[PDB]
Design a protein around this ligand. Structure first.
Ligand SMILES: CCCCCCCCCCCCCCCCCC(=O)OC[C@H](CO[C@@H]1O[C@H](CO[C@H]2O[C@H](CO)[C@H](O)[C@H](O)[C@H]2O)[C@H](O)[C@H](O)[C@H]1O)OC(=O)CCCCCCCCCCCCCCCCC
Ligand code: CLA
Ligand code: CLA
Ligand code: CLA
Ligand code: CLA
Ligand code: CLA
Ligand code: CLA
Ligand code: HEC
Ligand SMILES: CC1=C(/C=C/C(C)=C/C=C/C(C)=C/C=C/C=C(C)/C=C/C=C(C)/C=C/C2=C(C)CCCC2(C)C)C(C)(C)CCC1
Ligand SMILES: CC1=C(/C=C/C(C)=C/C=C/C(C)=C/C=C/C=C(C)/C=C/C=C(C)/C=C/C2=C(C)CCCC2(C)C)C(C)(C)CCC1
Ligand SMILES: CC1=C(/C=C/C(C)=C/C=C/C(C)=C/C=C/C=C(C)/C=C/C=C(C)/C=C/C2=C(C)CCCC2(C)C)C(C)(C)CCC1
Ligand SMILES: CCCCCCCCCCCCCCCCCC(=O)O
Ligand SMILES: [Cl-]
Lengths: 36, 442, 341, 82, 137, 34, 334
């Protein structure tokens, strides 16, 4: 069960970091009109 | 180019009139706080529990240690009057400045003075205004600490002998404790910051927060946002509003759970018992009645095979049986004397229940936070007779509704701020429709 | 010009409230149905038919007033004012439940009048008659619930009474006695109603968030002109959005708006059929396989068996007061009850 | 755009309109008031007054139980209160 | 039907003397019963001990009999268990325990008679509903 | 000129006249005591 | 050319058949977890002790349910609001008995649906659209939070959240009415007006546009072929639609502005469903529907029943029978 707990913690951390860093990667600029 | 129904958007770039709107609105808030307190006092009867009387502001004052003595008995109503008068008087000053700045004062402030004027897109000026308000907030948190430590203390429902006003001499400073709350699970038996159950932690948390806010205020006066923050945010008044709406929404949902579960900074003496509390108190009440009649409550097997009065929680603690099995995380000053290391202690139950505990359980069971919209107390099938809706239900429901609508407002304004910043909030340019210049999906 | 044609001319004049030939049926019947309800909910009791107060005069509020059904003893009497029950006495007619049949029957002919008006105006203006066709759904619901349903039962007593709480009681009756939530025809009605509200919301939002910038204002309503030929929003961008969000999207505006007609109208028609079955107590009450197992296996429990216990509670606890003509006397000891409650 | 009747906003801001209706509206209100305060509403519709639902030592409902004698049953019940 | 003096006539004591309340007393009694008692005794039951109700026949079998004004007024001063063997002022509102039940502090002797009269009149009006519980709602 | 009495005038008063009457009757009811 | 920026460009690409986006990075795994667990539990989960009284309720098909009766059963009342992930059970057998899957499914689902809403904002921004479709979806989303999260929080137990099943849903509705008199609560009445009105206006709008399609086809072909995707001209005559609807009622009760019309279509059901979601969310804290029980009494004090007292009799029958083995004490305080 502890192996399972660790795996999920790692998987969740990974996706959440993708989310946080993705939106920090200049998201306002990713539109089709004004990019600033 | 806004219509009348969006008319306050016409103020976005009129710093002077917008200041008046804010200050006049602030007057409305302080006016309600004063008028409502005086209304509550005019109706207050000292012989009735606060929570039979529809009071929500007097409980907040009492909780700060004003007007009450042991057990929560009201001893002096004058502090309540004072609080209401001073707020009411103060609202005329705010109303005066508000209507002056909204109607007569400079429409824009940028010309009258570079200090008070601002451009939404001026990241330095915006973080400086933020810094000032953070310092103000930090001072406000330290006022609570001042009250608790130097000016009479706070009401402590956990005080020995029924609850009392108590000066806090050793506030909790250990950051493992203070920030440990911020890391507890929000689920049952843990309760995130809602589980704070003693005034030492309450006051120490406000020392920390006061210092944190002052330090961060100084930080933001002195800095400009770093590039990574510049590129992550929208910098516009509507964007800033949307950020604050999200924060207020979050705070309102938290406040909702605080008043529903916490009986420390919302003492049940004033607010009535929590839902869990009342449910536990019912089981206590019938345990008491039945034991007095001769029942052996520890060995009484109920219809399901589980104990009728007592059973184990999933981790083994001895807890009240029946449906209140769900509420065994409840902790309250009338009940903890019966708790041993393994949970409820059968020998204390048999030997040490006191009349005041019997009274309090009976009182709380019959003042559970259930009632109709027209203030008929009890379950939905009850007949008319008792005029009662718990202050906890009033405060929980109202703040859930407000928090929900502010999240909607966050989404509304955050989406609009993004679209306006990129230039397509009024619709798609017929001659430059983005999708018409994209490849088809299939 | 013959007299008939001159009356046609007058009936069909463009005025603030169009009249038409349909108006001769619609306007008296609608006003009488509406006036009967207001009259009865303000002044008339249900004491002699139901043992209930039901008017403002008696102390009821907007939620509890009703024009209640006639007594079960009236059967399916038309309860005409001049009929054999009231014998022309207006007061007794009120006390016997005559306003119920008055409202229901005038209401029915008013509904016919209204659908005829939809036909009449559509023919005069030159449009297709789909709004009339759509309105068949409200008609089917009205006749099936207010007329067919009580006609299969013992009397008008068991029709819905015209009131907010009285309809609430009707809902609960249908749960406890008919297990109406388990009925696939009601389920199809639920899907068409909830599906319609979804379509309404999602179509309006889509249009409002795919608008073309046709003016400089921040209030986008001003940049529409009822005679412009151009579409005011982008079907193309709408289709791309929904295709990428949900997988599929509309591409055909005609199909889209026909579908919007189809979904709620069909759902209502389906629920009406189920109510026709309940007129005969032809319920979807049970699953036989479940009952056989549960009778034999006392450890077998499902949400289906749990809900039948609730129905059983509803029936025994509401019947004596809800059906006073039956003179049900249930001693305390026969009421089904769980532990403690 | 218009069918020739007089615009409502023109009517209800007019002096003559309010000369008439400052009488007719309160008059109708008072008529309806009196319809109740005199007790006439009770008698017209047959609605029990607060003292007329039950006889003094009675907790039985006067429920109509015949179709063709219903008129007489109601009358029988009312005389049990005189 | 109406609130006649016959219905407002209740036993004053165990010796058969009676007293006729006014409508004023009865309504006062009702209001005060709601103020001080209904939270536990709504409808003539007892939420914290349902085995004991406010039905007249139950009160008649209490020791001291409580189916009369005197017995009820005394009960409000000095409550006992149903067999009279133990005084229960510390867990039941009474004038003796107005320190711990503050709603009893501002009750006058006349208020006590009114409450007692309401308790005795209401079963005459409501029948089995008084004390019978949800079965009769 | 504008006509005074129209079909519209009738439809309006068919509803407004009894509405005010009923409103007065329902007002009086708030003072009925049992 | 940098790996992270190419990943960022694929995540936010408007060229993917289904848009992913940053909200999608959370939505996809959480919806797949909820969906896969749901399908497996619905088919094969063993019986669950929903009310914590060692009285397991069979919810899955292989244990004797059909599609109508089957459910994923809520987690045990013994757990209450405690977090019960798999790794907290001594075994999967234990986790299944106590209703673990319910928790996994609803938490993953609520997270995924939240991200679905954000994803709707996100693609609207990438496409240069206006942003508020996601605000329309907040009405159904709020309603799911109410029955899966807020109501359990207020009552203290996920065992009183809505079951994931057709008959389980009806059970939840009936119990709710007995304990909260939801029918007599104005926010639910507004929900009905939002949903009945939404269905009404759906049919109205569909029938008025359908009534005024411009003749572009013959009697032998579907009229739908008279519209071609992306054509610039409107396909119906809104002035004729208004000319019909304004006469059906009167002129000023009919829209001639298509923008106001479609805004109204959006706003009526969204706002109604917000209220009904707030209804459930505030009855979660036991601020219940109006109680007019015995509100009408006669000169002597006899109760004169109204239709509200009849509702009450029905509510009582629901109250006294529900969870018939679970109460030992006389008030069902949660
Ligand atoms: C950044 C962006 C934000 C996104 C971050 C997302 C992070 C995950 C969020 C987790 C959601 C929490 C769900 C469980 C909440 C719950 O059980 O919350 C309850 C807890 C309180 O827990 C209770 O706390 C209690 C504390 O009382 C204890 O201590 C008290 C001290 O006086 C008393 O003694 C009491 O008797 C005693 O029990 C006990 O621990 C109880 O067992 C325990 O249940 O509240 C809480 O932690 C307070 C906060 C809960 C917020 C409620 C969420 C509402 C969501 C709004 C959804 C609307 C969506 C709209 C969409 C459109
Ligand atoms: C807290 C609520 C609030 C506040 C504080 C404001 C404030 C403001 N509004 Mg907004 N507004 C609001 C609600 C509010 N509004 C609502 C609910 C609507 C929808 C109807 C609008 C619609 C709206 C529109 C359409 C417009 C504004 C505008 C304005 C600004 C100029 C108004 C002006 O000159 O009026 C002049 C009005 C008067 C001279 C009449 C008297 C007003 C006074 C202040 C009443 C004060 C009474 C009080 C008892 C005095 C106490 C005095 C004592 C303290 C000494 C002002 C800052 C305008 C704007 O942005 O200008 C560019 C504008 O065009 N508002
Ligand atoms: C926002 C927080 C809040 C909360 C929790 C309460 C809670 C309460 N108030 Mg207070 N009050 C408030 C704001 C608040 N009020 C405001 C803003 C005013 C000024 C109008 C008042 C004025 C006021 C008076 C004058 C009185 C109360 C009273 C009460 C009590 C009974 C409420 C009742 O029957 O409502 C009935 C329920 C409604 C009216 C439902 C409203 C539903 C709205 C329309 C939906 C809106 C959706 C959007 C926001 C209760 C303790 C009464 C009391 O007991 O005083 C001691 C009383 O007499 N309040
Ligand atoms: C945050 C709110 C706020 C802000 C940002 C401003 C900002 C401004 N005001 Mg406005 N004003 C406000 C509130 C506000 N005012 C209020 C509440 C009132 C009513 C009393 C007024 C009445 C007012 C008038 C009559 C005038 C201005 C003017 C001005 C300008 C110059 C101010 C100056 O030189 O003072 C410099 C600094 C001081 C004088 C020091 C004052 C120190 C304060 C009073 C102490 C802090 C108070 C504390 C928080 C309250 C304690 C709580 C208590 C209830 C127990 C500036 C744009 C002037 C203007 O625009 O001219 C065109 C002008 O003529 N203001
Ligand atoms: C009203 C309060 C407030 C506001 C609106 C801001 C706003 C800002 N701050 Mg300041 N700040 C404040 C208070 C505040 N600050 C205080 C009190 C301090 C002292 C500690 C600071 C210290 C501070 C520093 C040191 C820095 C900022 C920076 C910034 C900017 C970027 C913030 C950002 O990206 O956040 C978004 C947040 C993140 C990207 C990280 C998230 C981390 C949290 C803890 C995760 C938790 C999420 C979870 C779901 C919620 C539960 C809470 C959990 C801990 C229990 C922005 C202008 C930055 C800047 O540009 O400075 C010039 C910067 O480097 N702030
Ligand atoms: C701090 C809070 C805050 C602030 C400062 C603003 C500020 C603004 N909003 Mg945002 N808004 C908020 C919260 C806030 N909003 C919330 C919580 C929501 C979600 C409900 C919204 C939803 C929203 C929309 C949908 C829109 C705005 C718009 C606007 C702009 C013009 C608004 C205006 O003139 O209103 C004028 C005020 C009125 C027309 C009055 C509305 C009356 C309300 C709906 C009824 C209140 C009754 C209350 C419940 C009690 C009744 C009880 C009983 C009597 C029955 C302005 C920039 C507009 C915009 O985008 O401009 C940029 C716009 O279209 N707002
Ligand atoms: C469109 C108009 C309309 C329609 C369709 C109805 C329909 C109805 N009404 Mg309503 N009614 C209306 C207008 C209408 N009413 C108006 C304007 C009023 C106000 C006065 C009323 C007041 C009213 C009351 C008070 C009652 C009804 C009732 C009824 C029902 C029975 C009608 C019946 O038996 O007719 C029978 C009559 C006909 C069908 C007429 C046929 C014409 C014949 C063929 C010609 C006769 C030839 C002649 C006698 C020979 C002349 C020879 C000469 C030399 C002697 C039915 C639902 C009853 C009801 O609702 O029951 C619950 C009831 O009690 N109506
Ligand atoms: C709960 C906090 C109560 C309140 C408030 C009031 N009463 Fe009570 N009452 C309560 C209990 C638990 C009991 C049983 C006591 C016992 O152990 O025997 C009672 C009993 C009574 C009785 C006697 C009933 C009988 O003998 O059949 C009476 C007459 C009575 N209580 C009256 C009463 C009055 C007048 C109250 C308002 C002043 C009142 N009670 C409040 C619980 C509670
Ligand atoms: C701008 C604007 C607006 C707003 C406004 C506002 C919001 C205002 C405010 C204002 C205010 C906010 C005000 C206040 C005032 C107050 C006052 C003026 C007070 C007074 C007081 C007194 C006088 C007192 C007395 C007393 C005492 C002392 C004691 C006790 C008793 C008594 C209570 C008697 C509006 C929207 C409308 C419109 C547009 C514009
Ligand atoms: C007083 C008190 C206390 C204390 C407290 C404290 C100490 C607290 C703290 C708190 C805190 C410390 C908090 C924090 C918060 C945070 C948050 C809330 C954040 C958020 C974030 C965000 C929102 C982000 C977003 C984003 C992303 C993610 C990406 C990019 C973009 C953006 C930026 C948008 C206690 C309990 C002891 C007790 C009692 C009292
Ligand atoms: C039956 C009958 C008849 C007829 C009758 C009639 C036709 C009547 C009518 C009546 C009417 C016609 C009535 C009316 C009434 C009305 C009312 C009563 C109203 C009310 C209203 C209100 C209350 C409202 C309110 C409000 C609200 C709530 C919100 C918004 C605003 C308002 C203000 C709207 C006859 C004779 C043939 C004979 C036989 C029988
Ligand atoms: C189709 C249009 C029908 C119009 C119906 C209008 C009805 C008005 C009739 C009112 C008259 C009632 C007189 C009662 C006399 C009865 C005598 C008897 O029953 O023997
Ligand atoms: Cl229980």
């Amino acid at each position: 069960m502890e192996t399972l707990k660790i795996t999920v913690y790692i998987v969740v951390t990974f996706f959440v970091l993708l989310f946080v860093f993705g939106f920090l990667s200049g998201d306002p600029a990713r539109n089709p009109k004004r990019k600033d | 180019g806004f219509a009348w129904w969006a008319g306050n958007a016409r103020l976005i770039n009129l710093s002077g009139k917008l200041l008046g709107a804010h200050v006049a609105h602030a007057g409305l808030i302080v006016f309600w706080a004063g008028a409502m307190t005086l209304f509550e006092l005019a109706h207050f009867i000292p012989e009735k529990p606060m929570y039979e009387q529809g009071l929500i502001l007097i409980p907040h004052i009492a909780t700060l240690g004003w007007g009450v003595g042991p057990g929560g008995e009201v001893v002096d109503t004058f502090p309540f009057f004072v609080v209401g008068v001073v707020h009411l008087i103060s609202s005329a000053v705010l109303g005066f400045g508000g209507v002056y700045h909204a109607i007569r004062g400079p429409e824009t402030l940028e010309e009258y003075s570079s200090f008070f004027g601002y451009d939404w897109k001026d990241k330095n000026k915006m973080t400086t205004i933020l810094g000032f308000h953070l310092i103000v907030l930090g001072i406000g948190a330290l006022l609570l600490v001042a009250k608790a430590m130097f000016f009479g203390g706070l009401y402590d429902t956990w005080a020995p002998g029924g609850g009392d006003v108590r000066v806090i001499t050793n506030p909790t400073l250990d950051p493992r404790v203070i920030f440990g709350y911020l890391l507890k699970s929000p689920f049952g038996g843990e309760g995130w910051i809602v589980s704070v159950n003693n005034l030492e932690d309450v006051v120490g948390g406000h020392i920390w927060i006061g210092l944190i806010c002052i330090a961060g205020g100084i930080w933001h006066i002195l800095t400009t946002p770093f590039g990574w923050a510049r590129r992550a945010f929208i910098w516009s008044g509507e964007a800033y509003l949307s950020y604050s709406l999200g924060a207020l929404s979050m705070m309102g949902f938290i406040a909702t759970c605080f008043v529903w579960f916490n009986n420390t900074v919302y003492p049940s003496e004033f607010y009535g018992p929590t839902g869990p509390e009342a449910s536990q108190a019912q089981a206590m009440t019938f345990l008491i009645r039945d034991q007095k009649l001769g029942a052996n409550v520890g060995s009484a097997q109920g219809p399901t095979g589980l104990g009728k009065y007592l059973m184990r929680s999933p981790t083994g603690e001895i807890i009240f049986g029946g449906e209140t099995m769900r509420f065994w995380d409840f902790r309250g000053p009338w009940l903890e004397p019966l708790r041993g290391p393994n949970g409820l202690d059968l020998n204390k139950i048999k030997n040490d229940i006191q009349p005041w505990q019997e009274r309090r359980a009976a009182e709380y069971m019959t003042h559970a936070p259930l009632g109709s919209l027209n203030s008929v107390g009890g379950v939905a099938t009850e007949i008319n007779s008792v005029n009662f809706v718990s202050p906890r239900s009033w405060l929980a429901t109202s703040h859930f509704v407000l928090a929900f609508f502010f999240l909607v407002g966050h989404l509304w304004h955050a989406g609009r701020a993004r679209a306006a910043a990129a230039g397509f909030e009024k619709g798609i340019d017929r001659e430059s429709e983005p999708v018409l210049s994209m490849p088809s999906l299939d | 010009r013959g007299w008939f044609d001159i009356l046609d001319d007058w009936l069909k004049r463009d005025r603030f409230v169009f009249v038409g030939w349909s108006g001769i049926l619609l306007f008296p019947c609608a006003y009488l149905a509406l006036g009967g309800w207001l009259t009865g909910t303000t002044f008339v009791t249900s004491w002699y038919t139901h043992g209930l107060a039901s008017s403002y005069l008696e102390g009821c509020n907007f939620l509890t007033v009703a024009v209640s059904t006639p007594a079960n003893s009236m059967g399916h009497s038309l309860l005409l004012l001049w009929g054999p029950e009231a014998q022309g006495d207006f007061t007794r007619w009120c006390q016997l439940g005559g306003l119920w049949t008055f409202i229901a029957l005038h209401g029915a002919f008013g509904l016919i009048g209204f659908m005829l008006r939809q036909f009449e105006i559509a023919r005069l203006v030159g449009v297709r008659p789909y709004n009339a066709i759509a309105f068949s759904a409200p008609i089917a619901v009205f006749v099936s619930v207010f007329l067919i349903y009580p006609l299969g039962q013992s009397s008008w007593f068991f029709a819905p009474s015209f009131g907010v709480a009285a309809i609430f009681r009707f809902l609960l009756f249908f749960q406890g006695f008919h297990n109406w939530t388990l009925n696939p025809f009601h389920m199809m009605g639920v899907a068409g109603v909830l599906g319609g509200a979804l379509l309404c919301a999602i179509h309006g939002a889509t249009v409002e968030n795919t608008l073309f910038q046709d003016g400089e204002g921040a209030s986008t309503f001003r940049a529409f002109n009822p005679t412009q030929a151009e579409e005011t929003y982008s079907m193309v961008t709408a289709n791309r959005f929904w295709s990428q969000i949900f997988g599929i999207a509309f591409s055909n505006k005609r199909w889209l708006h026909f579908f919007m007609l189809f979904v709620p109208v069909t759902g209502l028609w389906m629920s009406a059929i189920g109510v026709v079955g309940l007129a005969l107590n032809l319920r979807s009450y049970d699953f036989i396989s479940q009952e056989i197992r549960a009778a034999e296996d006392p450890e077998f429990e499902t949400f289906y068996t749990k809900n039948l216990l609730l129905n059983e509670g509803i029936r025994a606890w509401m019947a004596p007061q809800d059906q006073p003509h039956e003179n049900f006397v249930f001693p305390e000891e026969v009421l089904p009850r769980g532990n403690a409650l | 755009g218009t069918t020739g009747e007089r615009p409502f906003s023109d009517i209800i801001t007019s002096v003559r309109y309010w000369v008439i209706h400052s009488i007719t509206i309160p008059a109708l209100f008072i008529a309806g008031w009196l319809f109740v305060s005199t007790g006439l509403a009770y008698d017209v519709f047959g609605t029990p007054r607060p003292d007329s639902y039950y006889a003094q030592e009675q907790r039985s409902i006067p429920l109509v139980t015949d179709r063709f004698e219903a008129k007489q049953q109601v009358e029988t019940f009312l005389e049990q209160l005189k | 039907a109406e609130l006649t003096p016959e219905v407002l006539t209740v036993p004053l004591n165990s010796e058969g003397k009676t007293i006729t309340l006014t409508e004023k007393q009865y309504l006062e009694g009702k209001r005060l019963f709601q103020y001080a008692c209904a939270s536990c005794h709504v409808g003539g039951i007892t939420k914290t001990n349902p085995s004991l109700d406010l039905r007249t026949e139950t009160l008649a079998l209490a020791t001291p009999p409580r189916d009369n004004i005197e017995g009820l007024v005394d009960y409000m001063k000095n409550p006992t268990t149903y067999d009279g063997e133990q005084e229960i002022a510390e867990v039941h509102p009474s004038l003796r325990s107005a320190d711990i039940f503050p709603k009893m502090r501002n009750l006058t002797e006349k208020d006590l008679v009114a409450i007692a009269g309401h308790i005795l009149v209401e079963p005459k009006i409501l029948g089995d509903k008084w004390g019978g519980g949800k079965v009769y709602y | 000129s504008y006509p005074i009495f129209t079909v519209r005038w009738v439809a309006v008063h068919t509803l407004a006249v009894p509405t005010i009457f009923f409103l007065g009757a329902i007002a009086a009811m708030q003072f009925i005591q049992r | 050319a940098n790996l992270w920026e190419r990943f960022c460009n694929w995540v936010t690409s408007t060229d993917n058949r289904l848009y992913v986006g940053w909200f999608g990075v959370i939505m996809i795994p959480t919806l797949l977890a909820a969906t896969i667990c749901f399908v497996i539990a619905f088919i094969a989960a063993p019986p669950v002790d929903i009310d914590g009284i060692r009285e397991p309720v069979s919810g899955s098909l292989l244990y004797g349910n059909n599609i109508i009766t089957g459910a994923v059963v809520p987690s045990s009342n013994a757990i209450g609001l405690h977090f019960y992930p798999i790794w907290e059970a001594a075994s999967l057998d234990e986790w299944l008995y106590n209703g673990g899957p319910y928790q996994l499914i609803i938490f993953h689902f609520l997270l995924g649906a939240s991200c679905y809403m954000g994803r709707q904002w996100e693609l609207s921004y990438r496409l240069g659209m206006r942003p508020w479709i996601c605000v329309a979806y907040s009405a159904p989303l709020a309603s799911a939070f109410a029955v899966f999260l807020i109501y359990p929080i207020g009552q203290g137990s996920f065992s009183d959240g809505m079951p994931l099943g057709i008959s389980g849903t009806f059970n939840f509705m009936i119990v709710f009415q007995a304990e909260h008199n939801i029918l007599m609560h104005p926010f639910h009445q507004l929900g009905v007006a939002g949903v009945f009105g939404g269905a009404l206006f759906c049919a109205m709008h569909g029938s008025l546009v359908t009534s005024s399609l411009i003749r572009e086809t013959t009697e032998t072909e579907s009229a739908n072929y008279g519209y071609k995707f992306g054509q610039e001209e409107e396909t119906y005559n809104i002035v004729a639609a208004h000319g019909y609807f304004g006469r059906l009622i009167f002129q000023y009760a009919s829209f001639n502005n298509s923008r106001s019309l479609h805004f109204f279509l959006a706003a009526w059901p969204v706002v109604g469903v917000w209220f009904t979601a707030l209804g459930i969310s505030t009855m979660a804290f036991n601020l219940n529907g109006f109680n007019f029980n015995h509100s009408v009494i006669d000169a002597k004090g006899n109760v004169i029943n109204t239709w509200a007292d009849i509702i009450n009799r029905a509510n009582l029958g629901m109250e006294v029978m529900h969870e018939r083995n679970a109460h030992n004490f006389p008030l069902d305080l949660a």
